[PDB]
Structure 1
């Protein structure tokens, strides 16, 4: 699907359970934190 249906804390339940989900998120969240200085996890978890 495309953009616009996105919700706060989307797929965050899966991250807490699945190991494959964590590796996808954390590898992604680490890169964004180092290069661009921000975390996608925080943005998704609580909407600023």
Structure 2
């Protein structure tokens, strides 16, 4: 989807680039490899420094929940 336009519009690939590059560096995980061939499963490796930096970044998101006004801080990623 759009991967044709992404091959054509300089002003368009300047979006998928600024996006995946950001995801590539912040979640170790690129969309441009997702859309051009949808994989069934996706394992995220937590390598060396970049790896640890990305894994804490994964664990840094919190799913709050309304319970009697309580902004209950609980973990997005339980297996992490």
TM-score normalised by the chain length of structure 1: 0.78
3-state SS in 2 of match to 1:39: coil
The structure whose Rg is larger is: 2
Which structure dedicates a bigger proportion of its chain to strand? 2
Structure 1 unaligned regions, length at least 5: 1-9
Provide the residue aligned with 1:28 in structure 2: 19
- RMSD across aligned C-alpha pairs, in angstroms? 0.4
Q: Among 16, 27, 31, which residue is 2:7 paired with? A: 16
- Structure 1 stretches of 4+ with a deviation exceeding 3 A read none
Structure 2 unaligned regions, length at least 5: 40-80
The alignment covers a number of residue pairs equal to: 39
Higher RCO (CA 8 Å, separation ≥ 6 residues): 1
